[PDB]
Fold this protein.
Amino acid sequence: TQTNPVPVTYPTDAYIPTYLPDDKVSNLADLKKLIEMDSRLDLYLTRRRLDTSILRCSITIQLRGVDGGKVQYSPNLATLIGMQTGSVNDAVYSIYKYILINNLFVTPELGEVKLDSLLQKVLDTNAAHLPLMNVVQTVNKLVSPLPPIILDYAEDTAKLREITKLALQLNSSAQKYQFFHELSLHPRETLTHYLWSSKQNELVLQGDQYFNEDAARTSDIYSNNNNDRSLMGNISLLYSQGRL
Amino acid sequence: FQCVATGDNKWQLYEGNATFFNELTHYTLDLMEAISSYIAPAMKDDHYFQTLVSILNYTKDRYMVISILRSLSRLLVRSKANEESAADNLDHKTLSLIVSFLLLECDSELIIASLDFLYQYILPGSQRITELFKSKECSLILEATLPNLLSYNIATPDYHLLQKHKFPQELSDVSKVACTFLCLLSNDTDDGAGSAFCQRIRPLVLHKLADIPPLTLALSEYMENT
Amino acid sequence: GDPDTEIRISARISNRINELERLPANLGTYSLDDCLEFITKDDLSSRMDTFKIKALVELKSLKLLTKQKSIRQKLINNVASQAHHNIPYLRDSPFTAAAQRSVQIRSKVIV
Amino acid sequence: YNNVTLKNLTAFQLLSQRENICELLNLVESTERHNSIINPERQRMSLEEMKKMLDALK
Amino acid sequence: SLPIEDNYIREVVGSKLMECVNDAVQTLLQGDDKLGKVSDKSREISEKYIEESQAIIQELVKLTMEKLESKFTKLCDLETQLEM
Amino acid sequence: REISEKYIEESQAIIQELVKLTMEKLESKFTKLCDLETQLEM
Amino acid sequence: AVFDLMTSPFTQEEVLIKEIDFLKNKLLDLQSL
Amino acid sequence: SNIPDPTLPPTEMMTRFLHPNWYALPTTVWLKYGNYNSWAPSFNENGTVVDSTTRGLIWLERI
Amino acid sequence: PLNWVQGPAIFHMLTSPYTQDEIINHEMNFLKGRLLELQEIT
């Protein structure tokens, strides 16, 4: 995956209302218990999913089983490890644990090690300090592959989408409840709010009707519409700014 | 906003004013995120800390959760070692949530914020490490995530290619923070609950040091403390 | 739009241009009000050109059409291009004020 | 249709605000939006599913 | 402000409900005697949505459980596998 | 209303029974696995 | 691109120093993202 | 002069108009973490005009 | 103490959108075309 979450088009777990009276519903607590039950169970599953991985001619035949599960060791590195032909990651871990046993870092101070006899023999170098990066880079060179035979002579997304859609319908029904409840308590200063805001939103929707194709190619904007006053009064300003 | 986030019957929010209120509460937290460094002595029965720790359980905004975590991180800075709000006001539903954010492998700002909160929470060490490693689920997610967060977004040497033929030289941004937190957690001496964790993580981190050589300079005080 | 019925307009204007451009240049009037001026053999009456000016206002106004179109574009795309700082009932709505307020948010300083 | 405009928000709020005032005067029916979401046969079918889950879980 | 091609445009190319509702509401905001006649008339309509809302809520309590059931049948997998 | 009242009044007992039963079964199954994992880790 | 005149306790050079200090930071923020 | 004839094909006058009643307004950004992440902060609202609830309702009554 | 100083160049763009992704290119062009004009003064 990425380093940041993926934006997506459809909603994802919108809220549950809390202002409904519990003397009538008495059920949102139970759905709440089910939701934190799901979150706890999902926490357990995600932790376990993370922790589950935590002339005479010769015969040359390249076999079926040329396989890097058991890779050949150089005999110097075989003497340093001890095993005959084990693996590559086992080799890296064994070399690093040998270095960690012999206390060679420092008693870059932890990058530089103290080169001893066998390790200089298996690396064919003669320094005293050499960083661990190059030491484990040489492991890639010191290992050779195994020799062949030689003879000479989902539905859950849609389900969660449905639960999200249903919770949105719950939000819609709760908002339509709360409107009529607040109108039921004090009706004066919500009907005045309606008569104000409906008028203002009608003016906002009717703020765009003189910008059509054939309403601007004609002449019934510029001439005789001092009733409108909005444009053709900017021309004292727009020429003075050089736009034209 | 705490009265909204808890659901108390006093001052139930009218929904039609909600867009008037919503951007009202994003501009206040950004003040509380900025001035909290100057409220650096945290008291016991504080109202800011109680209110934000009530808010953090409710919201679903990534931005607002990161702002609450940074505010609670920078509010407990020059704290104490004996008695402030962190010893009691974290009511264990919240602290089980902040450590849970380490499981989210995809995001990376939230992991850094959660590790910084736990790091600023764990600097005293006496009554803090036991409280952190007290729970059967808070002390157990850290056994799985924190060795895995060392090689987070780092090109480890793979072996699937070597099984199917037929080194990074760097770190990440959260690997440094995890190494810092684990070296600070290795300083819990006298064999309390901290080194009991720091001994049970070494056989798994030892495989991570064999892959990434910049984990040798880092994880130094932990390796000296084993 | 609809460029079927756009060419059927732009082919009636070429009719009027190539009908006005075949009038004779020596076109002149004779109103019924020159009798009150007593024009002699050579006197140059002062209402002789009330049709030739009118037959050039049309012929040059029907050639300056795609100049007033280009001025009307610069007018409308600088009056309607603001639309939320001059019109009062639009810059007082909730959502426009919230959008203009929210575009001005300066980015958060980490530490 | 993926994005919203000022016209879309204003039209949505005006539509949802005029649908609420027309239920006091009862000049609109709105029985279809009621009964397609209540659906009492779907309600008793869901309650039978809950009852069968009680039987299978006991 | 010159009509130049307006004649060729005219050659080739040749509500009340909510205003009455607004007048009705402006008459409802005059005398107090109708306001109670609004209020209880509104108060039943709120109840009409409460009988709506639980019919949504008792659906979610159904639709969660199968998904929870879809997480038990996976977790009883691990009851074997870890013990393996 | 009456069909709605019939299937909305009886249903709440079914709901508050079934969620508590799922609480019981899930708490039992988690107390099984949390003791299984310790004998794993030893 | 609209300029302005105003009073300040700083000289015109010091204002330009502050403009450099602000625009370097905004340049790094926007080129980094 | 350098004006064109009025019998040329650009006679459009409204092609790329885009009144600022028709602009896109900034709203909430729903995020997706993974398949089994059901406790995470699900969305993000930095500088939005409307909430998550009203934007979910606007999504609901179109689809 | 007064100092009559010329103010900073504020990027007031002609068309004003609301989403950020329609702004960032113009603001990058403004930052370049301001800091290059200002760099020679030093």
User: Anything to note?
Assistant: The CA atoms of residues 19 and 25 of chain I lie 12 Å apart. Strands of chain I lie at 4-6. The helical segments of chain I are 24-39. The longest helix of chain I spans residues 24-39.
